[PDB]
C-alpha cells in the first residue's frame, strides 16, 4: 500500500505530462490546419480569376475567327 | 483501501491505453497533414505555370488583333 500507491503517482505524473504536450501539438496542428484552409481559398480565388481571364481569350479568339473569315471570303469574291 | 486503489489502477490502465492510440492517430494525421501541405504547393505551382501559359495566349491574341486589323485597313484603302 505504501510504495504501491507510489507507482500509481508516477504513472499519473508521466501521464499528465503526456497529456500536456499533446495539448500543445494539437495547438500547433490547429493553426496549421487553419492556415491550410485559408490558402485553399486563395488558390480557389486564383482559379476563379484565371478562368475569368480564360473565358475572355476564348471570346477574343472567337471574334478573330470571324474577323479573318470575313477577310478571306471577301478576297475570294475579288 | 485494498480493492479501492485497485479501481484506480484500472482507470490508469485504460487511460494509458487511450493515450496510446491517440499518440498514434496523431501520427497518422500528421503525415497526412504533411502530404496535404506538399500537394497545396503542387497545385499552386500548377496554377503559376498555367497563368504563364495564359499570359502568353492573351499576348498572341493581342498581336493577332493587330495583324488582322492592318489587313482590314489595307483592303479598305484598295
Amino acid at each position: 500500500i505504501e510504495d504501491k500507491i507510489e507507482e500509481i503517482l508516477s504513472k499519473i505524473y508521466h501521464i499528465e505530462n503526456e497529456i500536456a504536450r499533446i495539448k500543445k501539438l494539437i495547438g500547433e496542428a490547429r493553426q496549421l490546419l487553419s492556415g491550410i484552409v485559408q490558402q485553399q481559398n486563395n488558390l480557389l480565388r486564383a482559379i476563379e480569376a484565371q478562368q475569368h481571364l480564360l473565358q475572355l481569350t476564348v471570346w477574343g479568339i472567337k471574334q478573330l475567327q470571324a474577323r479573318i473569315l470575313a477577310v478571306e471570303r471577301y478576297l475570294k469574291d475579288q | 483501501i485494498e480493492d479501492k486503489i485497485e479501481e484506480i489502477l484500472s482507470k490508469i490502465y485504460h487511460i494509458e491505453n487511450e493515450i496510446a492510440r491517440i499518440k498514434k492517430l496523431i501520427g497518422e494525421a500528421r503525415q497526412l497533414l504533411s502530404g496535404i501541405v506538399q500537394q497545396q504547393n503542387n497545385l499552386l505551382r500548377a496554377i503559376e505555370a498555367q497563368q504563364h501559359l495564359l499570359q502568353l495566349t492573351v499576348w498572341g491574341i493581342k498581336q493577332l488583333q493587330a495583324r488582322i486589323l492592318a489587313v482590314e485597313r489595307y483592303l479598305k484603302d484598295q
Binding site: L32, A49, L56 | R30, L33
Partner: peptide, 29 residues
Amino acid sequence: XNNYTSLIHSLIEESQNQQEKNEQELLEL
C-alpha cells in the same frame, strides 16, 4: 479584357507566402 491579371499576381504572391509559412509550421510539429 489592371483587371484580372494584376489580381492573379496578387493571389499567387499571396498564395506563395502562405505555402511558405504552412510548411514552416508543419516542420515545427
